């Protein structure tokens, strides 16, 4: 729609644009004053899904979370400044692997429940779990995305037979989707006709491959369970058995980036820079508005992270 | 529906990779190795995709970014395209704030290719701005998005930018060049003619047709610019003229050519020859099969084996 450059000039004051990296427009962009790489998402508007993946990311904030920086809405357009995540979807690594080794899945499953676990805490449900949304960042850690159908019907092979009737219980029995096709590269319940594989889902019943430990295929049959009242609980998952293999910790689910603590070098940083002192600067933060103010903090933090010095361009 | 299975034939022929765009995965076409962009689309998930494919199975040009295969299951349909690492002129064009007036005649010669051909064929494109030009490998320019084509002299039933006037209130190839007319400008200074953030004042000032003339321009290229922007139809430059416009022809002395170097009926002997050996055929038999252009896997091989010759490489299957 419209093909306007106007459109774009409130960004560019504080994002230089690279190239698009999705085509709902992604472009790849460099934040000014922090020189960090994010990804933008481009809206022309032309939904009620967009304000409820905005408003549950202001709320939510967590390592495995792909994170909002930077909400900016224009007379025609809405821009997310979002997190950027090189390492591809899941889903691709799935298919480019045939299928995840035990300990691979291991790995990776943890930090699916990481996310998960926090999710519910904060009171919501993704609805909507499934590999096309979990992504890869540079450090090829998982942060979880889409959270347009999250709440205070996805994808129907990673959905629970409860919600296709008529919360959290569902995520579990996707994340147990999930965890099947890590091990084994192609669905639990799948058909060409739609018809047929809703009704594989109900029956609950699916083949287990010969690859499979005895503990795996308990796990899942704990995930599994078609009753949603049956389903394993997120706290009893958290150090379940299996999780703990090779580990010996209970998944550390407790978010690592805070709404209230602020790192001291980069409110020092942000308040050299517009000339204040601490406590206008850290009133000015904690609004947490979602405007460039809490871009640059969130990057100057996230740069500070990764070794580099603390310091916004000179200009 | 998230299912799998739906990838199964086209594993078969192509080896996924990352997405790099409706979802666009890149991929390697198996028997030759050759690189590829298959456009995935999920059938419960418009008839613009029925449009597109069946213009670009009879569009075939240097600058028109290729279909090489088309492949449908109970779910989902996909594209197999040609594979253009170069990103979008309009991207390049943000990078470059704005480009040279020769630089902007190499690039604009090929755009004028690639509509020239295109309605040579009976058809506008009907959406052309830079978002919808990609470069290749070899930075040339690839046309794509042919999902608003139409055949204007054809059975009836894009941005506003780029629209014609004549689009606005309610016809032909002409309205194409005036689409050519905003590409031009754009390229040239970098910021469209005409544009505003109220989209009332944007119709207006494009059926106005007035618009800013920067000091960096040429006399040459105002003239063009005002030869391609007539906000009459009928004033518009003609496809024709445009072909051997003295400002298109400046540093280059010869027309564009725009006639197609992609043919639906030479065949090459080399390509036929490997195709014979590997489908256990001989020539005219092979031949047969090959022009009869079904974009199966066959149809794309052969257009990949020939791709695989052009660039110099050894023509040989897996």
């Given at each position: 729609g419209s093909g306007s450059m106007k459109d774009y000039d409130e960004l560019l004051k504080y994002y230089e644009l690279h190239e698009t990296i999705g085509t709902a427009k992604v472009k790849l962009a460099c934040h000014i004053l922090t020189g960090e790489m994010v990804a933008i998402k481009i809206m022309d508007k032309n939904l009620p899904r967009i304000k409820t993946e905005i408003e549950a990311l202001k709320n939510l904030r967590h390592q495995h979370i792909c994170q909002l920086y930077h909400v900016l809405e224009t007379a025609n357009k809405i821009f997310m400044v979002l997190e950027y995540c090189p390492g591809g979807e899941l889903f691709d690594y799935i298919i480019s692997q045939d299928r995840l080794s035990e300990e691979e899945t291991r790995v990776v499953f943890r930090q699916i429940v990481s996310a998960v676990a926090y999710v519910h805490s904060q009171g919501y449900a993704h609805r909507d779990l499934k590999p096309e949304n979990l992504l890869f960042d540079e450090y090829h850690k998982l942060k979880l995305i889409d959270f347009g159908l999250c709440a205070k019907c996805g994808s129907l092979a990673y959905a629970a037979p409860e919600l296709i009737q008529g919360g959290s219980e569902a995520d579990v029995w996707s994340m147990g989707i999930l965890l099947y096709v890590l091990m084994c590269g192609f669905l639990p319940f799948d058909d060409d006709n739609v018809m047929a594989l809703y009704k594989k889902i109900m029956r609950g019943k699916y083949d287990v491959p010969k690859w499979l430990s005895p503990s795996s295929i308990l796990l899942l049959q704990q995930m599994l369970q078609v009753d949603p009242k049956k389903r394993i609980s997120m706290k009893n998952l958290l150090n379940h058995p299996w999780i703990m293999q090779?580990?010996?910790?209970?998944?550390?689910?407790?978010?690592?980036?805070?709404?209230?603590h602020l790192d001291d070098d980069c409110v020092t940083e942000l308040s050299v820079h517009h000339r204040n002192n601490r406590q206008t600067m850290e009133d000015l933060i904690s609004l947490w508005q979602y405007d460039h103010l809490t871009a640059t903090y969130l990057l100057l933090l996230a740069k500070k992270a990764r070794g580099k010095p603390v310091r916004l361009r000179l200009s």
């Open positions: 090779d580990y010996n910790y209970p998944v550390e689910w407790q978010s690592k980036n805070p709404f209230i």
